[PDB]
């Protein structure tokens, strides 16, 4: 009986794989990018990438290939999962609709098979006879491609060679032919085999087995005109074919390992090469013609081109554009030029995509002391290292603050016929109108001509022809720029109020009830035109001249009042088109139209807070996409703001919302604001690219942030951060960091670039003398980062080969100072394990960093929590609980030695602890008896842990080696010595990601319980919450129903995906829920949605509301 719920807060951002070709059309260059369980499809263009289709899979993509067999119009996608789900994919556009379809699929794992050295490799033959896979040592699976094989049936074949490194099929071949470097005793070697599938053997390859280097790691297969194979090692490259052996040993690649590659020219005179350093090489093949004979080769060379992010993945695109898929760092788009710049880099970045990198540690700190957590992560590694501050919501910066309990609208106002700037803001009020002439940035309220002060103003537009408009209850008024007086004045024939105003800078439409007029502000006067009456009361109207008409506005839309409805119409005619008959007894408070790039739009707010949304047509006039959001609880006033190129839609609600643009779609992110009643663009000399915004009581003005549900700030560290601490009293962060340096010719270590440790504002080294008795060393530092500017205030450098492994920020004992404590370790290649290290207690003062105290230890301090004014610390399979003397020193109290190697710890308010490397978890208590630990219980499964957390007194969360989560609680049962000294694995789940860090906090706010966030190697940020048994049940049910309705993509069973799995155990998930899957609900059509209920009660739209209240947990 364990009840937990997991959702994604940030989708993985690392790029594991990427591939190029014609998948969308046969004319079309596509970029395919694999995240983890996410597949991105782009179309390449002049600007770069046009986005097209982002889908998710129920597995971690491990192999991704594009290929084409005979009589096939365009390319097909091959995908293999880490749990051996295989599938073939076809890109299908039903005119306006997009589907990735599953042409074939099956699961290719074997019951036998020890998963190999160098993981899964999948390859495809140049002709497309087949697919070759290498999932296991000794074995080599083969899936023949045919019209059938719709379940991808495969035979295996025996491989003499047990330690294969890399494999591809050779171009220009009679029979199917693989080619591989394998390792045995005497070194590494290269080998070939035809594959005859008729008899499923191997047969014999066309070229003897030659040697290749000790570090041979990549096999490149050179396309037809050339044929053959390129092998890459450390410091060397080589080429093989027939009796042809060409080799180069360019000192320049010796520096670091090559690691990815990519064919540039289809013939393959040229290839791209990626280093672990970030360096980008070009590999060139000098061809050679002999008259009536096929092309040969003469020579090959290597040219350093520049520097990218650390490349996992490389793909030449159009014309000198190179996509650079990174996972240690941000992915990027790059230009290659014939001409170097200054520094001599042929590479120029064009675009940069943010990867939350490997998130290595993190924490939550309401920077701006708000109630919303911001999250701060250690990201990246080496030169890509960084901090990333992560903030939900679109925020704004408040310039003035005028307490005005009333404000019932507000439009712009330029006190001049030329400047874009408006030095006045007329604001409809509680039955009145006040005016605000500005001395620029100064607030001042005066009078104005033909604009009433004892009459509410329903409008203020910006009508051309040098005139200012004031629609009021009574009469659509007029004032001039030349005259500036009572230029004109419309009035309703019988003396009846305008109910609902609307217009632009050229058009006017009012309404009296169902009554519809139409007038125009023609040179210095208001001339009338059409008329019509309506079924019921007119609730709201919108007019604005769209794409193909300046000022004079085409068709229209309106909301009625009894039938609760909205409908489409025209201009002087008023002819009724298609419509929608929305439900309820609450009317549509708003309903305006707009566009952006390539679509016209209609949206309609109601008064219950909810909203219905639709796209339109300037010509025709048709329906669109019926769905129903929620935003506020209160009425919602739609508007439109000056941003960048795509000036957008703002929602005025008790929960202020912006509507931006997605793929070509529309965003729906929170605005980090109290509450907003009305709002408009603005621009005064005192308040430029502004946005006015009024609430319950008070005017305000400011700019806007990016958009994405989340903002991610930046902080390039240039080395790799490792741990992170917020010490609030000192308003800074402690961050452990590490830089690489190289031996000298003084032997001593130098550096490779300016880091944050070396560009620090000030600095220490460790002086302390506790110990006695080319090449690459790490140098470790404690950084002190300003929470406001994110500057390295101070840097302390540690001893030669001291690695700083743990960090805290606490007060100890009676002592009222707050310290920074760093647990360390001495480290050497020779040694298995360290056997000495120290704990150092530190204080940051005004601008100083004082080594307050040291303490030697006899191993690695892997972790340390602060306990109860005491300091508790894991030290090489030996837990210790220190105490702070009054004399200011760390002195032992007790130990626990029952650990293989204690990696993680956490503390439950009381006297409880937990942790371990290859066991699972233990719990302990402290006993204010003899100040000892009593070992309360453990878990006897072989979990290679990676992170650990206490959800609460009894629920312990754990992540591990194999991308699985699990939960433990102590048995509540009789015979309380054996059954008590065990705790059962009550929760199981396969995440699909690897968790470096848990921790308490949330990104939201000022049903569920708690909130634990995690960060993963991949960029993904998840969140774990707790449930009521009832809520669990509803959701488990609804999970199972939801799976019937949704078609996965390889056809993959969702439940097969989610199943606890190790290379030695496989159980289905219990006590865990993906909101990820739950949330899917909403993007399902009401029909398919209907089904999910056949059946305290049974409903249909309750559940929609229930998923809603959830999507807002993050």
């Amino acid at each position: 009986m364990s009840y937990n719920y997991v959702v994604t807060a940030q989708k993985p951002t690392a790029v594991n794989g990427c591939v190029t070709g014609h998948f969308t059309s046969a004319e079309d260059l596509n970029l395919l990018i694999a995240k983890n369980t996410r597949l991105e499809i782009y179309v390449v263009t002049a600007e770069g990438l046009r986005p097209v289709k982002e889908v998710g899979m129920y597995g971690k993509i491990a192999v991704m290939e594009l290929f084409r067999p005979k009589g096939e119009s365009k390319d097909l996608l091959f995908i293999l999962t880490a749990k051996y789900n295989a599938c073939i994919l076809e890109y299908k556009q039903s005119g306006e609709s997009i589907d990735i379809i599953t042409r074939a699929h099956g699961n290719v794992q074997d019951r036998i098979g020890r998963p190999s050295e160098t993981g899964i490799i999948g390859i495809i033959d140049p002709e497309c006879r087949m697919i070759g896979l290498r999932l296991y040592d000794g074995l080599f699976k083969v899936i023949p491609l045919d019209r059938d094989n719709k379940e991808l049936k495969a035979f295996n074949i025996r491989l003499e060679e047990l330690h294969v490194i890399d494999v591809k099929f050779l171009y220009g071949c009679q029979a199917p032919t693989i080619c591989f470097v394998y390792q045995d005793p005497q070194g590494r070697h290269v080998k070939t085999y035809e594959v005859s599938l008729r008899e499923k053997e191997f047969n014999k390859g066309p070229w003897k087995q030659e040697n290749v280097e000790a570090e041979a790691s990549m096999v490149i297969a050179v396309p037809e005109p050339f044929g053959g194979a390129i092998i890459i090692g450390q410091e060397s490259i080589t080429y093989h074919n027939g009796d042809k052996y060409l080799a180069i040993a360019p000192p320049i690649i010796k520096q670091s390992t090559i690691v990815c590659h990519n064919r540039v020219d289809p013939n393959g005179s040229r290839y791209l090469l990626g280093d672990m350093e970030g360096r980008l090489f070009m590999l060139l093949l000098e061809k050679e013609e002999q008259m009536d004979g096929t092309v040969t080769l003469k020579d090959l060379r290597v040219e350093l081109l520049g520097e990218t992010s650390i490349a996992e993945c490389l793909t030449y695109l159009d014309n000198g554009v190179v996509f650079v898929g990174s996972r240690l760092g941000d992915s990027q788009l790059v230009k290659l030029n014939v001409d170097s710049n200054e520094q001599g880099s042929y590479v120029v970045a064009m675009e940069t995509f943010t990867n939350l990198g490997p998130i290595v540690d993190m924490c939550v700190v309401d920077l701006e002391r708000q109630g919303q957590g911001q999250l701060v992560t250690c990201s990246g590694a080496f030169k890509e290292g960084s901090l990333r501050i992560i903030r939900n919501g679109i925020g704004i910066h408040e310039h003035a603050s005028i307490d005005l309990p009333g404000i019932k609208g507000l439009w712009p106002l330029r006190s001049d016929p030329n400047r874009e700037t408006y030095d006045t803001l007329v604001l409809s009020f509680v039955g009145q109108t006040r005016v605000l002439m500005l001395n620029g940035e100064e607030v001042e309220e005066t009078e104005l001509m033909g604009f009433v002060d004892d009459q509410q103003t329903f409008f203020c537009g910006n009508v051309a022809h040098q005139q200012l408009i004031q629609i009021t209850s009574a009469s659509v008024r007029l004032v001039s720029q030349e005259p500036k007086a009572l230029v004109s004045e419309w009035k309703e024939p019988q003396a009846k109020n305008i109910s609902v105003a609307s217009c632009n800078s050229s058009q006017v439409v009012v309404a009296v009830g169902r009554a519809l007029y139409y007038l125009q502000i023609h040179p210095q006067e208001l001339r009338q035109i059409s008329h019509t009456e309506m079924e019921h009361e007119v609730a709201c109207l919108d007019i604005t001249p769209l794409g193909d008409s300046n000022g004079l506005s085409p068709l229209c839309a309106i909301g009625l009042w009894t039938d609760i409805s909205a409908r489409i119409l025209k201009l002087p005619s008023f002819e009724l088109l298609h419509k929608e008959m929305l439900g309820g007894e609450i009317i549509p408070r708003s309903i305006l139209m707009t566009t952006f790039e390539s679509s016209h739009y209609l949206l309609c707010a109601l008064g219950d807070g909810a909203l219905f949304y639709f796209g339109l047509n300037i010509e025709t006039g048709l329906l669109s996409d019926r769905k129903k959001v929620t935003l506020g609880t209160q009425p919602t006033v739609l508007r439109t703001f000056r941003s960048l190129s795509t000036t957008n839609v703002f929602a005025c609600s008790d929960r202020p919302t912006v509507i931006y643009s997605s793929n070509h779609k529309l965003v729906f992110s929170n605005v980090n604001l109290k509450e907003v009643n009305y709002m408009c663009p603005l621009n005064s000399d005192g308040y430029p690219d502004s946005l006015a915004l009024a609430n319950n009581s008070t005017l305000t003005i400011g700019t806007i942030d990016e958009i994405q549900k989340l903002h991610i700030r930046t902080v390039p560290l240039y080395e790799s951060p490792r741990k992170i601490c917020y010490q609030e009293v000192s308003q800074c962060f402690g961050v452990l960091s590490s830089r690489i340096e190289v031996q000298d010719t003084s032997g001593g270590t130098t550096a490779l670039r300016p880091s944050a440790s070396t560009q620090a504002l000030s600095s220490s080294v460790s002086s302390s003398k506790l110990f006695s008795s080319g090449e690459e060393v790490e140098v470790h530092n404690l950084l002190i980062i300003d929470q406001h500017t994110f500057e390295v205030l101070h840097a302390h450098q540690f001893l030669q080969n001291e690695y700083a492994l743990s960090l805290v920020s606490c007060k100890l004992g009676k002592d009222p100072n707050t310290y920074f404590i760093v647990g360390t370790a001495m480290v050497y290649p020779e040694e298995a394990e360290p056997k000495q290290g120290r704990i150092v207690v530190f204080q940051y003062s005004d601008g100083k960093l004082q080594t307050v105290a040291e303490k030697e230890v006899k191993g690695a301090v892997y972790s340390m929590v602060e306990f109860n004014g005491k300091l508790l610390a894991s030290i090489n399979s030996t837990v210790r609980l220190y105490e702070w003397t009054t004399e200011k020193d760390v002195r032992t109290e007790c130990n626990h030695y029952n650990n293989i190697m204690a990696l993680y710890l956490k503390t439950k308010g009381d006297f409880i602890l937990v942790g371990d490397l290859m066991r699972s978890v233990l719990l302990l208590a402290y006993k204010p008896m003899e100040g000892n630990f009593e070992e309360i219980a453990r878990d006897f499964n072989p979990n290679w842990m990676s992170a650990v957390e206490i959800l609460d007194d009894d629920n312990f969360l754990g992540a591990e080696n194999a991308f699985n989560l699990f939960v433990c609680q102590k048995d509540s049962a009789a015979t309380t010595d054996e059954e008590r000294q065990h705790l059962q694995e009550v929760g199981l789940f396969h995440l699909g990601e690897f968790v470096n860090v848990f921790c308490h906090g949330s990104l939201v706010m000022q049903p569920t319980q708690g909130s634990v966030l995690f960060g993963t190697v991949n960029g993904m940020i998840g969140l774990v919450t707790s449930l009521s048994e009832s809520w669990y049940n509803l959701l488990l049910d609804m999970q199972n129903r939801l799976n019937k309705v949704i078609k996965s993509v390889g056809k993959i069973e969702h439940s097969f995906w989610r199943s606890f799995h190790t290379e030695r155990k496989t159980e289905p998930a219990t006590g865990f829920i993906d909101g990820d899957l739950i949330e899917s609900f909403l993007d399902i059509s009401r029909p398919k949605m209907q089904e999910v209920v056949a059946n305290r009660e049974a409903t249909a739209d309750d559940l929609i509301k229930v998923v809603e209240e959830l999507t807002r947990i993050h």
Binding site: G119, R327, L328, P358, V360, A381, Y803, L805, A825, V827, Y828, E831, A832, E833, P834, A860, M901, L903, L917, S946, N961, F994, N996, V1017, N1018
Partner: peptide, 13 residues
């Protein structure tokens, strides 16, 4: 050192 080891399983494969 399993420490090389942690950092590595830590930054991924």
């Amino acid at each position: 050192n399993a420490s090389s080891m942690l950092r590595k399983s830590q930054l991924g494969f």
